[PDB]
Write a protein that binds this ligand. Sequence first.
Ligand code: NA
Ligand code: NA
Lengths: 300, 300
Amino acid sequence: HMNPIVVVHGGGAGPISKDRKERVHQGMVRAATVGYGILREGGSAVDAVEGAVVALEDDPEFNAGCGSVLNTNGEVEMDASIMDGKDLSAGAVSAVQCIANPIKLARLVMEKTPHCFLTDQGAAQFAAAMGVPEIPGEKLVTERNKKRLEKEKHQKNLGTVGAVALDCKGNVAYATSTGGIVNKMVGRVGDSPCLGAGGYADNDIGAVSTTGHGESILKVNLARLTLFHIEQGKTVEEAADLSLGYMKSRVKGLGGLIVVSKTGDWVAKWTSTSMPWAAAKDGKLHFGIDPDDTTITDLP
Amino acid sequence: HMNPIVVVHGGGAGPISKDRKERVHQGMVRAATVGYGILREGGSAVDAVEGAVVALEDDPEFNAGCGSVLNTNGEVEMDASIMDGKDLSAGAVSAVQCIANPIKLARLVMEKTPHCFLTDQGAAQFAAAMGVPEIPGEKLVTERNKKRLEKEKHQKNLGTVGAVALDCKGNVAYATSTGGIVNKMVGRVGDSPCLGAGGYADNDIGAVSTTGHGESILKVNLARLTLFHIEQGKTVEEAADLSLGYMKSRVKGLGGLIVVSKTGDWVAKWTSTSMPWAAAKDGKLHFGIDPDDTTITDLP
Ligand code: NA
Ligand code: NA
């Protein structure tokens, strides 16, 4: 059997201000510690990624669930996806409204339906039938983001989130969740709910979770493109640098990903300014935002 | 400069009824003629695939626009996408109702919003805002689709449609459009609006559009997969062989596809029992529905 791993990430974009840098650091750690925990105790790769992204979703500091950015109407519209590499089972939702955790509902889609992807009205109807509580719009909206929008009509890092794991039985997974872009049109769907773009998981290769400007990530299929390079004989760092290499040069898009290979090698790389990220393996925690600021602490 | 080619497909699925052959034939014949009619005037690939798909949306013989299957709730919700192979530009709509031409909506996403993907109520909102006609819903509903929904409510060939083309400037483009699968959950999204799944187009490789089990085409990112093999030097036939057989072995999915390379080489291939298709090249027009049984006649 294999040593478990969990990698998680925040926004793949601009510099984080001194202010929020302690909260960001804290949130990635809580996120990865939840993930590793499920993995410490024998749990699944999917439960570990569902786990970590749920913590981040609830944390107002991350651009997912509560604290998601506003659309043009000043409304929170969220998307998310999950996938299990064993047989490639997958779940996604776009432009979901009035719920704390889209990733959980994406996981509901994956095991409680014949489908892989529900949107808007129908995804709302499937939430209800499943018993997901409706919370008012204002439980999701923050004064930070309330400002962000009003000042966008007339350098940032929002906090798109994701997670990849490997469990003790050699199974991989990913989850990604986002509140989208600031001032996005109504019903704009980015890369997070789209298999192969927002993320991909395959037992025979590895798992990726991406962040950045969705539109580019979607155009280049960033997640599947990374894994195509791994099959091609490249290392996790090599593949990342190449896949991220194309996105900058072909579509002028920057950002970041995280990867775990089927064999336990892991990396976090970015062409944007910064990506918050944490990694938990072998009783230590790995963390970082700016290039080469990486710290290691032993985990309990 | 290159010789232009367009390829069209309906759905790669069950046995076509005999009282339905000529009618699908005339449909495939129309759509392929219309597309090559556009290329022959020095039209762009993006122009050609759009007009070809429009012809199939307007045709009640097929599951896209007029002739879409009904969901679990008696209504029409449609998916469409389209991609320019030159700058990797793209537009796509999912879960739209009460418009005539979802593909025409997909191009307005490409051409007139800084986004790639729109959905459901936000797609209908944008459409009303670009003067797309908001038509009566039952006019997209045919007698037959009411009958299939009751049969299921108390395997088959549901002709989901698409086109690829290489123009006289060397550009490639795909378009795909659908109502999806009968009795579907409200707000279901399939492969057809998703990039790298229902299609992909890239001037450095070529273009592909797909048909079959939509969750299955998604899980395996079929179209972009097809292109990966053509990236390794495999003919377009071996590549379509490798990607269709892989979706088969891994996720148990049957499907089909058309593909044209940057050299102007092309094939229509499938693993389901039938898949009506047609292609235009060198003033000649090819049509088929089954393997072994192809016809080649002059297109004056
Ligand atoms: Na949050
Ligand atoms: Na039609």
